[PDB]
Design a protein around this ligand. Structure first.
Ligand SMILES: C[Se@@+](CC[C@H](N)C(=O)O)C[C@H]1O[C@@H](n2cnc3c(N)ncnc32)[C@H](O)[C@@H]1O
Ligand code: SF4
Length: 340
């Protein structure tokens, strides 16, 4: 069940680094089809005659390259910066906002020059010290779901664990966390899981681990000493959402009863979509129940790029207040970091 690619691309320069050498040896030993590419941002010859075929095949394709853009993007409100360990995901969440993010690729991409990346991370920490600097490792990927192949996240966790003023955080929809349990995190990593109503998970989250799988992993990471959190997103106003999300928090509390939840955190993100989302999503998921009706939404204009549609102010406030009530009921003391 853990992700294994059916096609792997390598940058020639990637083989000069330990991870690239290790991955090349791994996949050749497995007999998997391996190709060369000049740049990880320009991958040619992904099989498929239709757009849907090429998209689906890309989702089973791994690309191993070198990170050359060492300037870290901002990752607010989650963290100060996004640490770039990987990009892309094997999941097929119908609503995934990465689909329409500028310059996003459907294939999974891992970076091998971890010395350069952690060194730059340390520079950002030093620049802000003694203030705390948080890094988001899953801003443009499901870093946890991919990590059993590389252990790049494990190395990042222990790198941050050794720092005085550095903190790490990431969120996942995958249960494959066994290799991370003995990591020397030193209490400086927030391990989060994306959760949602039964409606949203069943209809819009194929190719990910089940709710029970995510919670089993949540119990594992909490027992291993990680700081635990949840991300309720996308908060989606489906038919019967009020009761749907009520039963989510009720079941979440039931599956976490007995554990210490004094330092538990919640993050809330309402469903959002961009102008090109409808054409992209309808092409990739023709039978989706996802409502992308812009006429009943509020548009927030972009700054340097394009904007996004979110629920109207009164609908958004209704979602926020209701979610805060459920968290207050089932998890008293737990901290809601934000609603957006
Ligand atoms: C980009 Se997701 C990367 C991390 C990992 N692969 C994961 O799924 O947890 C980060 C979060 O954002 C949510 N999310 C994704 N799309 C949307 C969206 N369109 N509207 C509102 N929220 C959206 C997802 O449910 C995640 O909780
Ligand atoms: S698991 Fe996360 S990154 Fe992957 S498709 Fe779903 S929302 Fe997107």
């Amino acid at each position: 069940k853990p992700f294994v690619p059916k096609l792997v691309y390598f940058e020639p320069e990637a083989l000069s680094y330990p991870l690239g050498k290790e991955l090349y040896e791994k996949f050749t030993q497995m007999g998997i089809k391996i190709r060369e590419t000049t740049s990880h941002n320009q991958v040619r010859g992904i099989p498929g005659e239709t757009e849907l075929a090429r998209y689906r095949n890309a989702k089973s394709t791994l690309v191993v390259g070198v990170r050359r853009t060492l300037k870290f993007d901002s990752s607010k409100p989650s963290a100060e910066y996004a640490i770039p360990l990987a990009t892309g995901c094997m999941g097929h969440c119908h609503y995934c906002y990465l689909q329409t993010t500028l310059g996003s690729k459907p294939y999974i991409r891992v970076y091998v020059n971890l010395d350069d990346i952690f060194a730059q991370a340390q520079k950002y920490i030093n620049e802000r010290a003694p203030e705390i600097t948080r890094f988001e490792a899953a801003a443009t990927s499901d870093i946890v779901g991919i990590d059993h192949l590389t252990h790049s996240l494990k190395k990042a966790i222990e790198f941050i664990g050794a720092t005085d003023y550095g903190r790490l955080r990431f969120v996942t929809k995958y249960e494959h966390v066994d290799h991370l349990l003995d990591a020397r995190h030193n209490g400086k990593t927030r391990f989060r899981f994306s959760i949602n109503s039964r409606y949203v998970i069943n209809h819009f989250e194929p190719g990910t681990s089940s709710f029970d799988g995510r919670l089993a992993a949540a119990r594992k990471v909490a027992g291993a000493g990680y700081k635990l959190g949840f991300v309720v997103a996308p908060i989606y106003r489906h038919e019967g959402w009020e009761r749907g999300y009520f039963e989510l928090f009720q079941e979440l509390a039931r599956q976490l009863e007995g554990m210490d939840l004094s330092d538990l955190t919640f993050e809330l993100i309402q469903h959002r979509f961009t102008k090109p989302a409808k054409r992209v999503i309808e092409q990739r998921y023709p039978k989706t129940r996802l409502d992308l009706d812009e006429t009943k939404r509020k548009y927030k204009w972009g700054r340097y790029g394009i904007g996004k549609y979110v629920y109207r102010d009164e609908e958004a406030k209704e979602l926020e207040d209701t979610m805060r009530r459920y968290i207050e009921q089932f998890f008293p003391g737990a901290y809601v970091q934000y609603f957006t």
